[PDB]
RNA sequence: CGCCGUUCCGAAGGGACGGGCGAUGGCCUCCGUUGCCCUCAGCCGAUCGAAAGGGAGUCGGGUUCAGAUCCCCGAAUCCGGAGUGGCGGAGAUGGGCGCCGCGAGGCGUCCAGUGCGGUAACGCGACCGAUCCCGGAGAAGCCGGCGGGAGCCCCGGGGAGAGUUCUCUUUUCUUUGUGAAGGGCAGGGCGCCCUGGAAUGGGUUCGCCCCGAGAGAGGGGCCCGUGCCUUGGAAAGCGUCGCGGUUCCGGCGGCGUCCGGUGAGCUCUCGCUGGCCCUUGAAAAUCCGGGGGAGAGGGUGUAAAUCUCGCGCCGGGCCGUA
RNA sequence: AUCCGUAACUUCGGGAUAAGGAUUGGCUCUAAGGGCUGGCAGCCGACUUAGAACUGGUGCGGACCAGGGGAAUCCGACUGU
């Protein structure tokens, strides 16, 4: 697994042809994005609540995505 | 205590069959095999005892798969000559070679008078 | 404190083999253990590696040298003559 | 008496250029606050010419005989200095402790080096500062 | 019948960068393949020989009547291949002069460009290069002492469940997770670098031992980091309480999975230093670095040769396994 | 196990746990032996040793574990087979 530190670089990595699917997990300190490529599980984690649904809405639209529970 | 036990068919005490304590997810104590220790190299020398630096210590099929800044340092002879006996191999054969051309000019000189 | 009166180095040895064949290994066992001063850097680091090899832990130089001892009467005799013979050798 | 002064060629001991030849450029035998010890500005062959024959013709001699060089600040105890001297007119105002600050002066500095050396080596001159030490 | 012999009485190479002559094809542009010649070429011994030696790379959870590091779930990784092997990034993209413009910059020419940082140790994401050559790793005994990390044991508290309770016991018992791989940081080690120059010698260990061939003291660099944090990952596992179903469901919910101490302790491991030898404690496959510089690449761009860098694409057959 | 004590002979290493004595429980104390933070103060701690009182029907290495000793002679030096 590889971790990811800005938003950017994440959306980069939901636009790879190769990505499968992005899991949103929601904790009680934080939210994180999984998106699963061929190879890496890649993971943001985002602490700030609001800044989780704005990205959650910015999502490529193709891209499968699974909320977890 | 949990009492251990191997994971392979090897259940004698080889050099390849060394093992570390893992505590894992489901909260129990298994093995798992280590890899052996790698070395650095040994400086090309053949005189200087300690072993180079800025070169991963691992097994010799493992440096296939690393690049090359890995394996080696920014200098002559780099990651295969200590830095210690390139100054020394500088000086030698700069030294040397001035002594070439102090004991040419005598010669000459000598056969001039001669 | 003076531990032992004579056997010294030998007292490993107990009351084994004799006190003539322990009288003689002592002279053996302590200049085999020796550190002789290097010749080449000065310091007293020329400890015996094997049979007949010492090895300087500063410089790292290796010698051929006696069984028990770093140089042999017999091996400096020599160096000498063949020394003046080169000499006369040449002239 | 003292001999670390420019236009001296020295061999580089120690780094990335190890038995590469430069030239003092500026020495500083006093050192200075950010180096209080003694070093030296100097300019050297990062990558010498290649042997070059009658057997070649004109663009591939050319091509052979360009100079790589190096602007660099050394410690005195890195460098071995030798009995021969080499005068090429390298431009201080351009070749400078102050090229450190900033790779646009650097590249310069570099470019300076190189051109004279280039112009220097053809002639013929100073033959031994332009053969690389084989050690 | 055969036996000896294993480099010894042997024309023991069927290979190759490259070059020149042709022949065939195709994404027919020009490149492959292919035949011959030239050039280059030590290995010097076929082959077999280890389910404890060498030898890349897989772990956590669940699952059966019986198999699981093999099945399923999840997370990885080695090797090989693809130049129709794809996309990024690197090579890479600068400067002089002359015009135009207030400038930002734009045009025309002329030159450079097989990366860069550090005094250094050495660092950075790559960072061309063949025959040939040098070296490293694989690859090294036994014993002692000491130190670091773990697992276990122990001690003091919080929970959750259980035992005892005639008397006493804030009590006794059980249980109280986080894999590989990647990143970061402790910790450990260095016979690594720079300044400097030390006797009124000093530093220092359980022991030693170290220094003008550079000590103390400062400031750095590197290697291992199996320890902790983080992604993995709470979604799982476990404890306990409570609900459902066809009720043979990876069923669904609440809560919890917490905070400290200590040791010549035991086991394993990593490291430092010593002792012993008329004893000195494998070889090879395999992998790597360096030295050299035969060559190749483009003429300022639609950039090229090239890349041990980041992604991406395809595959891993055979036998054993209760 | 602690404390004391220990000969002949000797190849000076031994002999040697020579031989020979005394002590040992339980309980309540005393002293000494350290670390961290800021000749002192506070806060933490790890088992040890020595000493004393009291105490039991003199029992106390209470089971277990655990060398009898000395003086000589023959042979072979020893360890090993
Ligand atoms: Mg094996
Ligand atoms: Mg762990
Ligand atoms: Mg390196
Ligand atoms: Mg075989
Ligand atoms: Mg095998
Ligand atoms: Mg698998
Ligand atoms: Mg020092
Ligand atoms: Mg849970
Ligand atoms: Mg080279
Ligand atoms: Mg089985
Ligand atoms: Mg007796
Ligand atoms: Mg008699
Ligand atoms: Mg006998
Ligand atoms: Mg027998
Ligand atoms: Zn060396
Ligand atoms: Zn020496």
Redesign the pocket.
């Given at each position: 697994?590889?971790?990811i530190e800005e938003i950017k670089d994440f959306l980069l990595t939901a636009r790879?042809?190769?990505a499968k699917s992005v899991?949103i997990?929601k904790?009680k300190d934080?939210v994180?994005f999984?998106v699963?490529?061929?190879?890496?599980?890649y993971?943001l984690?985002i602490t700030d609540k609001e800044k989780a649904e704005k990205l959650k809405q910015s999502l490529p639209p193709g891209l499968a995505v699974k909320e977890?529970? | 205590?949990?009492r251990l036990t191997y994971?392979?068919?090897?259940s004698?005490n080889?050099?390849?069959?060394?093992?570390?304590?893992?505590?894992?997810?489901?909260?129990?104590?298994?093995y798992?095999?280590?890899?052996?220790?790698?070395?650095?190299?040994?400086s090309?020398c053949?005189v200087?005892?300690?072993?180079?630096?800025?070169?991963?210590?691992?097994?010799?099929?493992?440096?296939?798969?690393?690049?090359?800044?890995?394996?080696?340092?920014?200098?002559?002879?780099?990651?295969?000559?200590?830095?210690?006996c390139v100054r020394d191999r500088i000086k030698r054969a700069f030294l040397i070679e001035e002594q070439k051309i102090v004991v040419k000019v005598l010669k000459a000189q000598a056969q001039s008078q001669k | 404190a003076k531990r032992?009166?004579?056997?010294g180095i030998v007292?490993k040895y107990?009351?084994?083999?004799?006190?003539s064949l322990?009288?003689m290994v002592k002279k053996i066992?302590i200049s085999?253990?020796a550190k002789y001063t290097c010749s080449?850097?000065?310091?007293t680091?020329m400890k015996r590696?094997?049979?007949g090899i010492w090895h300087c832990?500063?410089?790292?130089k290796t010698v051929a040298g006696g069984?028990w001892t770093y140089n042999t009467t017999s091996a400096v005799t020599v160096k000498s003559a063949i020394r003046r013979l080169k000499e006369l050798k040449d002239q | 008496g003292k001999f670390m002064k420019p236009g001296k060629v020295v061999l580089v001991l120690?780094?990335?250029?190890?038995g590469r030849k430069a030239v003092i450029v500026k020495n500083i035998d006093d050192g200075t606050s950010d180096?209080?010890?003694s070093?030296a500005l100097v300019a050297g062959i990062?990558?010498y010419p290649?042997?070059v024959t009658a057997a070649m013709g004109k663009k591939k001699i050319?091509?052979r005989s360009?100079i790589?060089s190096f602007v660099?600040?050394?410690?005195y105890?890195?460098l071995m200095p030798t009995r021969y001297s080499v005068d090429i007119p390298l431009d201080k105002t351009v070749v400078n402790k102050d090229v450190?600050r900033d790779?646009?002066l650097?590249?310069?500095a570099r470019?300076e080096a190189?051109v004279k050396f280039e112009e220097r080596y053809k002639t013929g001159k100073n033959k031994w500062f332009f053969q690389?030490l084989?050690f």
């Open positions: 697994p590889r971790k790879r042809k190769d899991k997990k904790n934080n994180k999984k699963r490529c061929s190879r890496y599980l993971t984690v977890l529970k | 205590v949990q994971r392979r068919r090897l004698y080889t050099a390849s069959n060394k093992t570390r304590l893992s505590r894992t997810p489901g909260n129990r104590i298994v798992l095999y280590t890899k052996k220790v790698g070395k650095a190299p040994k090309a053949g200087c005892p300690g072993r180079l630096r800025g070169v991963r210590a691992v097994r010799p099929k493992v440096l296939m798969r690393l690049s090359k800044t890995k394996k080696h340092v920014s200098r002559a002879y780099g990651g295969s000559m200590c830095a210690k | 032992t009166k004579k056997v007292g107990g009351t084994r083999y004799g006190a322990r009288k066992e085999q253990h080449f850097c000065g310091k680091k590696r094997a049979v832990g500063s410089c790292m069984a | 120690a780094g990335r250029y190890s180096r209080p010890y070093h990062d990558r290649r042997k050319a091509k360009k790589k660099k600040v050394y410690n105890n890195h450190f790779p646009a650097k590249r310069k470019r190189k690389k084989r």
